[PDB]
Design a protein around this ligand. Structure first.
Ligand code: DIZ
Ligand code: DIZ
Lengths: 96, 96
């Protein structure tokens, strides 16, 4: 989360089928996570498939990728935390 | 429009306050347009403010532009025709 209220970073959530598959494919193994954990695994993911741009590393390109289907965009910046979060929020259910 | 029938491109619409200002900001001067015209002005806007990705030209990076707020995305592909129509529709009222 970095600059997302730490309180919000610990928010307990249940990823929907598509996001859950993304997570487990990189090593995750629960059905319930904290936002901070999702970001972490989503972080490994980006890193392993190298969805980042070599010369412009803070920009991710997920056009022809499963991530692109979850987020619904061809690219985003890892510097804009609030936007990534809301993009992640649509692929899960917040456990109350 | 494209991938979208001509019957749909000619649909009559009334942009909402923000999209309207957006349109008039690039030379438009009506309060009601056809989808085809909105796309055209929106095309000039994108081009005029150089919002296209230099190395992935089919991607409109509108993250830090008012266009980002209206479309609700940090970016989008000009190949996703139906998605663009949807984003535009949310910003207007179809003149019945
Ligand atoms: O570790 C961080 O603090 C940072 C981060 C950036 C934005 C947000 Cl919302 C949370 C965390 N982050 C990265 O900088 C990062 C960037 C790339 I390019 C690749 C991996 C990576 N690793 C991270 O753990 C996160 C991160 C992971 C997934 C996503 Cl979608 C965004 C950022
Ligand atoms: O001219 C077209 O047929 C095409 C177009 C693409 C998608 C849709 Cl839905 C309608 C029209 N189009 C562009 O390819 C385009 C691309 C860029 I990058 C910049 C301008 C541009 N000009 C256009 O007239 C359109 C277009 C304009 C605005 C938007 Cl939001 C999307 C496409």
């Amino acid at each position: 989360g970095s600059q997302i209220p730490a309180s919000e970073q610990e928010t307990l959530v249940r990823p929907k089928p598509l996001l859950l598959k993304l997570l487990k494919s990189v090593g995750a193994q629960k059905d319930t996570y904290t936002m901070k954990e999702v970001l972490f695994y989503l972080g490994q993911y980006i890193m392993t498939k190298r969805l980042y741009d070599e010369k412009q590393q803070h920009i991710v390109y997920c056009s022809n990728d499963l991530l692109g289907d979850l987020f619904g965009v061809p690219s985003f910046s890892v510097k804009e935390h609030r936007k990534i979060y809301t993009m992640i929020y649509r692929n899960l259910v917040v456990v109350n």
